[PDB]
């Protein structure tokens, strides 16, 4: 209902945590558990190869159907461009139902 | 200078004519030539297979470059459409230099 694809057996969920580094433990014994730790974190590179299938327009629509294109005029900040601050955004949302496929 | 392609050995020129059908010739001899004929013509189907080579955009232009598309609004007579009289025309001229190729 949020559009997209559904699967009876969808790609899994990836879960991670940082190894519990128990801080300095008491010299003498204690029955309780350890709460003290060392604030730490990590980084890394996320790789995700998504293969894709497609069906291209084979229609004989004689007239030039409509396409999607950035407006060909001159604007201050280019679309999907990075504002002079690196922070970039998206000018507008985009759909797929563009190619005029005969019903 | 009219844009396009030039060739030192371009596709030939095709020339045709109707067979000279000499009308009723004089019963007795005449030195001169024949001018009388029968007004006639012919028709047929023109076939022309043009094979083509192309180079597609492989650019990593992150932003959506510009494309050419019929204006997505509502007009009285669709572009390149046949007016209600079969006689159709072209709304506007079209060029190629559209894809933003890095210089």
């Amino acid at each position: 209902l949020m559009g997209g694809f559904g699967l009876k057996h969808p790609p899994p969920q990836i879960l991670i945590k940082n190894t519990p580094v128990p801080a300095d433990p008491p010299t003498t014994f204690n029955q309780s558990k350890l709460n003290s730790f060392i604030t730490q974190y990590s980084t890394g590179q996320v790789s995700v190869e998504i293969e894709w299938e497609l069906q291209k327009e084979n229609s004989k629509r004689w007239n030039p159907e409509i396409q999607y294109t950035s407006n060909y005029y001159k604007s201050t900040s280019v679309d999907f461009a990075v504002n002079t601050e690196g922070v970039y955004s998206e000018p507008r949302p985009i759909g797929t139902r563009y190619l005029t496929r005969n019903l």
Side-chain angles (χ1 to χ4, degrees), chain A residues 17-36:
Chain A
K17 148 182 165 55
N18 294 313
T19 295
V21 175
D24 180 304
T27 300
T28 299
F29 177 70
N30 165 52
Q31 195 301 299
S32 183
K33 23 116 295 182
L34 282 299
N35 46 298
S36 58

Side-chain angles (χ1 to χ4, degrees), chain A residues 44-60:
Chain A
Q45 296 64 62
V46 293
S47 302
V48 284
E49 292 190 299
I50 327 172
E51 294 191 358
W52 295 86
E53 180 61 355
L54 39 158
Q55 298 183 62
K56 39 60 187 178
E57 183 269 60
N58 192 183
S59 172
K60 290 295 197 303

